[PDB]
Symmetry: D2
Subunit: 317 residues, 4 copies
Amino acid sequence: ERTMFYGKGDVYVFRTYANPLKGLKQIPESNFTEKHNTIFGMNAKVALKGEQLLTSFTEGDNSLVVATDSMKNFIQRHAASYEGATLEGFLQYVCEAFLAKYSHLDAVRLEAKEYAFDDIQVGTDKGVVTSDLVFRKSRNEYVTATVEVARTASGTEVVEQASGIADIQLIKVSGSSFYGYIIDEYTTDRPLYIFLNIGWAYENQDDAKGDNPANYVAAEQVRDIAASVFHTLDNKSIQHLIYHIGLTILDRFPQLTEVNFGTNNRTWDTVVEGTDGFKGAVFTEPRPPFGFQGFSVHQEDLAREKASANSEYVALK
Amino acid sequence: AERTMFYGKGDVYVFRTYANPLKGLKQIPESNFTEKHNTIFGMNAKVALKGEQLLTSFTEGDNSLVVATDSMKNFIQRHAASYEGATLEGFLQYVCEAFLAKYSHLDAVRLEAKEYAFDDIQVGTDKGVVTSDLVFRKSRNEYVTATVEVARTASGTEVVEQASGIADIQLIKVSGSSFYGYIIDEYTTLAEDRPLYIFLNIGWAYENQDDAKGDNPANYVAAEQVRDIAASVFHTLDNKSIQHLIYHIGLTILDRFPQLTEVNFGTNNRTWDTVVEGTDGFKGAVFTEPRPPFGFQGFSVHQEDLAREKASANSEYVALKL
Amino acid sequence: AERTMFYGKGDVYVFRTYANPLKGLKQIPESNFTEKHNTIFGMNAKVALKGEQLLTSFTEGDNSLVVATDSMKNFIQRHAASYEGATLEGFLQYVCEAFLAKYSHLDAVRLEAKEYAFDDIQVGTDKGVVTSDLVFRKSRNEYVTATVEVARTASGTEVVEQASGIADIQLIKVSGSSFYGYIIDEYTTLAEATDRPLYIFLNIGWAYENQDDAKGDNPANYVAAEQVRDIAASVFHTLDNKSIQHLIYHIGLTILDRFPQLTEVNFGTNNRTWDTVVEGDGFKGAVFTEPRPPFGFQGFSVHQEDLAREKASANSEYVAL
Amino acid sequence: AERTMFYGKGDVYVFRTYANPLKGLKQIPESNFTEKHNTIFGMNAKVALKGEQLLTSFTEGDNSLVVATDSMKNFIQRHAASYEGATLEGFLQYVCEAFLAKYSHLDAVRLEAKEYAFDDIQVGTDKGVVTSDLVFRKSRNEYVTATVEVARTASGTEVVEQASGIADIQLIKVSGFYGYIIDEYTTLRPLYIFLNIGWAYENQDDAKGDNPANYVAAEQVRDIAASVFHTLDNKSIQHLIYHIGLTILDRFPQLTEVNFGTNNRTWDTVVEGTDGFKGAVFTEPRPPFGFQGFSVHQEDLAREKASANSEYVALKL
């Protein structure tokens, strides 16, 4: 009932030359098939839980306390020995190691944000090619994952598993207005500009380990789906947009039970209206308030659309 | 049967001037804070609308039952002008209930707010150095927080979630602190006294949620008082860990405010690394910032914990007397 | 002598505990600040080394005459332990001169520092509520700044730049600020106002006539940033300003008036008028919100000659406590 | 001998859509960049006005000759719609000159700008995976910078300051620094650097892009930096930025000088590889960072090209 946990945050862990992720399912929305993992880096945050931690608070008894500094060492050492190719697999690997090492712990939770790097083009004597030595630190969208593992009477189980992509920022330079809303006493065209966080859950949680890559859903593919649907669809709202992104993701990945969204509307204000469309148009940043949406799409929703004569859902062949 | 579904407006800055003052707070030994003049009553609010009838706005792109997010902003700002109370929680509940009264198709309204904090300042006048009633400093230090969610009931509405807190307390204690007795194994850093430096977020929950409205200020728990308790306990107690510290901070808060059911904590250890050891304690010592990793704790203390301590012959819990 | 050339170490966090206290400051009408206990004497320092003999470290990758940057960090941190003074400027000049004495191939050393600021707090005790001598709050508000650059000379060393300042003062005045009379043409949309809730960010700096006054050996001649801050706040409180330009001119005059040992006070300002959402009273009961991102800014310096002119003019509007 | 005096407006976000494209850039071995479509031509601008006649606005609170800062914002945004050029430097000089022509009491106008950068992205279509012409990613990576200040002459106006640059390049190089001074203060990996690069034109009008073959695009400079970092075995960051500068001057003889501001953000080793970087683990260091500032000039390049002990090598044309 009581809240009780402790751990170490901002655990920067950068593994070089981890095993590559390869053999992904090819989809129309994306060219992403592999992730070379030359840098396999992340910002991890670990929390330990257990009833036996109580007196560390109530009595200042450090006897059963794994030092937070030691947890950091623990994570960093397991990054060196990990042989898999995915973030989710690594986190579950570390969680299970903690539990095997410390019998007095009841559960371990790991959250991680990718420390992202981009491949770049460099000029060489053989022309302009992709570098295998130099990479750009990306401050754009990044992969996320959360795994919590708890002890059971017969072993361990994953009690939470999350996968995602954060901070997708996209603008569409086409006309967008957004009408038909309630007009009352509280009531007071432009390139729709959105921030998107996307997460998903697996039917079979072992698929996230990447042991069979055809069943692993790479965040990069999801991002490409989102971008493609955004590009193609004539949306009626951000709500409407993310429903179709969700349907498409579920369509490409039947092994997922659910896809969820957290959005921001960051559309500019018009300052000088264009003379023909957006040709000659000038925009600026709006006042700080931003619209946001939260929504989950499920396989049952996809089945519903596919069986409805009135559905507008369309995906690439 | 429970899809995630909500939408709203964030970063809704609302700055109300000359709101009704909060006065008549319970006087406690840990604090001199008894009143908050509310000359500026400002916040960053975030509103979310929920309801089953919102489904087709996603699935069909039907905006017929959609309250525009810009309209939500207006709604909040206008209610900031009409609000006659003195607390953040009271304002949020007022707005939540107003939304529900206006839009019958909505099932629940959630308001989260971060105080846009200001400090009184001392200025020179012909009458000497006094507190200004015109000029205030924008504080980038600790700030008050609150969340209120109100949902429909069979006979009307109710608060289904209520949180109150103080965020971003950053305190250092320049006395020798060590922390010993932890597990030592193969994962223990090789190397074997520093000024404990902590970040603190503190929250609390009311037994009767109406106490947060401040209609009777004697039952209102001011975040400023809570902050002063934390600071005082940190000062007086010789702690064995951050875990141990926040337990005693929690007990003290519950002791001063029996109308609270729970006090919760989120902490960071941001203690410096030693570079030059002092030649007499911390005299002549030099420290620097550590590598990024930080220890953290999360914990809740409840009235049952306090009653147990007071009934225990071996308790080390001590509070200043009234 | 036209090339840009320097290297060094940034984000050198240096936290000295129990430094010698700053006490015996000049007492003034705008402030009660007379001493700074320096229980924590902390800063974020930035050091740059300059010199012609550093050229080949760039052009030839020759590290022979290179003080490695980690060594600069150690050097600074060790000197924080030995420094016996009470001011930021004194510490920086102390470090600069030490570097030049240690490394003869150096021509000049530059130190910039931003204070790592802490607040005294009130705690409850059995003897009542008092100021704690053990627990301090990390302040994310205004902080002290200083820059010292020292170059080698034929006879020793000289200070070639000395700066002192206070950064990130953020103050709001709810009423008592007007903006009217400006140019009205095809580009003006802004309504003229006799009253707006002025919200300002202020960076204030100053220069000493005698640069050694900054070492704090005679605290009565030392200008503490805390005093300058209190002056700015007081002038903001008292003056009915016509613009931020008008305001900072008077702040500067007032500062120079209290501290005749200063040659100039300079300003870097930012302005953020809230937007009115519900008009209030009048102005009590009003609701405001944050405006769009654009902000007005001002840069300006006031010198003793300006103050002398104001004091002798029959048309002067300058008034001090 | 002269007081500091200026005022203006900062955070002037200006987003022009479908500006005239930048095309016809000089082809170089280090880069594939030949064009910038300018579908979005966006920036964060900062304008400062100067003039003797501004004195009484400070000293007397006299607003008679004061162009309100809000009006400056409008002035800039309105000039964004009519600007017919293709470069950031050209737009800024255009606005500077417009201000001076409009307000005779002004002596000089200074504009600084940070690009509000967007990336082309790949989307799935019925025609396959292609670059979208509608949807763009907001980049939080490196961005173009420029500063133009224009002052009056007896016969018109002149550019008194002109700067062009690229800010916040963040590159890591995966491959394996010695010889520095060893004394009592000396205690002392994949080199990780932050780079700001700027340059100056021999003929400042080249920055207008009226003759694109003479315009130096920040994208090309960035690709040069990346290419040199990739190929060169550096002995220090000082040594590295010297060669980046030489190569830039080599590709762009119309530049008089290139300047650098660098940060060393190299990780700390936690688990050593067995060996090379295979199995290696790194983490973030304590905050202190090495930095360098440096300018390279054409005279340096001419010296290197004629020197027998020169180590300078560039890719062939």
